[PDB]
């Protein structure tokens, strides 16, 4: 349970750096 | 738990190259 929050917290991290990627390549 | 922190490393650093991508884009 405290390992998959974390995971998901990570998942989060990476899905706003892919979104900041594609406002920079619009 | 020895598998997920293997895990956590790893994505770890796939969100660091994506922010490295994310810099050189901008």
């Given at each position: 349970?405290?390992?998959f929050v974390q995971?998901?917290?990570r998942?989060?991290?990476q899905?706003?750096?892919?979104?900041d990627?594609?406002?920079?390549?619009q």
């Open positions: 349970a405290l390992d995971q998901f917290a998942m989060k991290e899905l706003d750096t892919a979104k990627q594609l406002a920079e390549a």
